[PDB]
Amino acid sequence: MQLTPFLILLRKTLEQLQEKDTGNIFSEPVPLSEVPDYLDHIKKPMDFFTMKQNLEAYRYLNFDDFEEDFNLIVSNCLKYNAKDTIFYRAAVRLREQGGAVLRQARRQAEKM
Ligand SMILES: Cc1nc(C)c(C(=O)Nc2ccc(Oc3ccc(Cl)cc3)nc2)o1
């Protein structure tokens, strides 16, 4: 398996995941200026912009590690936010819609 087609697939998949985040609440790191206690509870923050940086820094050489950082976006949000919030429901919706995107992308990868 050659590296450039795989990275092309991951770039497309990250764009498709970002599209499911129609509110753009997962596109950038959670702003500590507004949420100063965020790092007290969340030990590995993650967001789609950071994922894009990691992608280009070759830190995703297999689908599992890509999907792991996507799962962090979801679990950080379920963890920090109360169940009755918009943020929490948005993470539940991203988990569902994002899982479908990831499953189709993984089959594409498995064909390479
Ligand atoms: C996935 C997730 N978990 C959390 C806890 C958050 C989160 O707090 N997001 C967030 C916070 C602030 C902000 O900008 C402003 C919003 C309102 C005003 Cl008045 C000024 C700036 N934009 C996004 O996102």
Side-chain angles (χ1 to χ4, degrees), residues 1-42 44-103 105-110 112:
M1 195 200 214
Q2 157 170 59
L3 172 63
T4 288
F6 179 75
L7 292 181
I8 289 183
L9 175 52
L10 291 195
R11 284 178 193 110
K12 182 191 182 192
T13 303
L14 190 62
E15 269 201 334
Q16 297 175 322
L17 292 173
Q18 289 223 53
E19 291 176 15
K20 300 321 192 162
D21 176 22
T22 57
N24 268 48
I25 72 174
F26 305 110
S27 302
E28 280 158 21
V30 164
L32 323 178
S33 83
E34 327 292 314
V35 195
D37 75 340
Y38 192 65
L39 292 323
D40 293 357
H41 317 263
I42 308 312
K44 194 180 178 203
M46 188 51 58
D47 66 272
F48 288 135
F49 179 72
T50 298
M51 281 191 70
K52 183 56 151 111
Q53 315 310 295
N54 293 344
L55 201 164
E56 304 300 344
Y58 302 110
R59 199 37 193 70
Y60 308 135
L61 305 180
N62 56 68
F63 207 80
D64 278 352
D65 294 328
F66 182 76
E67 181 147 8
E68 175 181 290
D69 277 355
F70 167 82
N71 288 345
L72 269 180
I73 296 175
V74 169
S75 67
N76 289 167
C77 190
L78 300 173
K79 177 171 177 191
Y80 181 85
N81 300 286
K83 282 185 92 186
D84 65 4
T85 65
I86 288 198
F87 287 144
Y88 187 100
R89 179 48 68 152
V92 172
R93 196 189 77 193
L94 185 65
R95 181 181 72 210
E96 306 171 335
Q97 303 203 104
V101 170
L102 284 167
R103 167 169 189 167
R106 187 188 281 277
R107 276 189 285 99
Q108 283 310 121
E110 291 174 356
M112 299 179 162

